């Protein structure tokens, strides 16, 4: 009969399935299909991509979340819980002979006024202050899941993201790279000065240690050339067999000799080399290597300032580059020259050590994520009181502003402020504490001239400061989440009624 009731009601069912999955701790709800593949995932968008929707109107509320996920990723679920709340309150006002045009006018006006509030409530932090940066380091280590050593693994990350920052103050995730390797503990990860390669030579004949040496960059191959004009190969002399085995082997003896005369003690080529040529390198003392990734040849010259060369047939003395820092060290046996820097890198690599691959994979997925959550702060430079601590403050500012606007539209403005009280409610119900009995204390702090970084701690379970413990998130997440929900929920209310259109393509 009403039609619109079934539409707004369908959206609530989608929020309840993701309302309890908010915050770090939260149970999961798997929805296995009739196939048999049983999968479980706590993330939000992962459940939306695999879900059998009932009504077609529900797709409108899901499309708006996919666009926000590709931008920031985190915070998309925060806009769905608020949607299900502001829609439920519409029923309480719809029965009061209130037309949807008056309700939509409140959200559009209240959402715009909120833009001028987060700018003042947000805190300013510089992308250099170590006193404030170290505090953000311990905030991310606790969110993911690794409190066994939040003091050592956090300090190494502070000096990493803070050193790879460019002059303008930006940073990208492509410059960070993670690896894995066995070890005795998790405190051996350090940094020296140089560059590392992600591939090792497939032989044990060339030298293995040469103190004080120069680096040489090569890229050319050794395959037979090919003329542009077409042609066909024809063989009619079976005698040609026991000739190229010795002739081809001689073309490399004189080629490698030119490399030593130029003054290159180290070499990093791509293709392979005959065995006889490798024996000479051992007596001459030229710790050479082969098989290198293309992306690796770009950071050797950009860090140490070497001169990258593309041709191997010609190699003069000027083509020599320069080494950064050579030092000896054993890697659970063989001793190579592995050193990395962080002043002006291109693809820094960290050697994670551990006793078992289990703990290594856990911390391995934490260092790469630490640069993502922190990389955004280095670019923007504006943070707020996350963890539902910034919404309680807006509840007091909107009420004072609602008194200025008169008429029947003031009812929708007050409902918007109260609708934001669901963020701390869901986080409280998951911990087992009565929200009605704790929400009265958090408001007491924000009574007049109280701190603005106050909130509730899920661990201790008491009112504390957010900037002190560790609850911080970017600004674009909260600001865009409220704006995205305002423009996403209005599309559901502006629908006059269903239509029986035929042949909808």
Author numbering: 18 to 522
Task: Give the article text.
Chaperonins are homo- or hetero-oligomeric complexes that use ATP binding and hydrolysis to facilitate protein folding. The group II chaperonin from Methanoccocus maripaludis, MmCpn is homo-oligomeric, consisting of two 8-membered rings stacked back-to-back. Chaperonins are further divided into two major subtypes, group I and group II. Both share a similar domain arrangement, in that each subunit consists of three domains: an equatorial ATP-binding domain; an apical domain that is involved in substrate binding; and an intermediate domain that enables communication between the equatorial and apical domains. By contrast, group II chaperonins occur in archaea and eukaryotic cytosol and have a built-in lid segment protruding from the apical domain that opens and closes with ATP binding or hydrolysis.
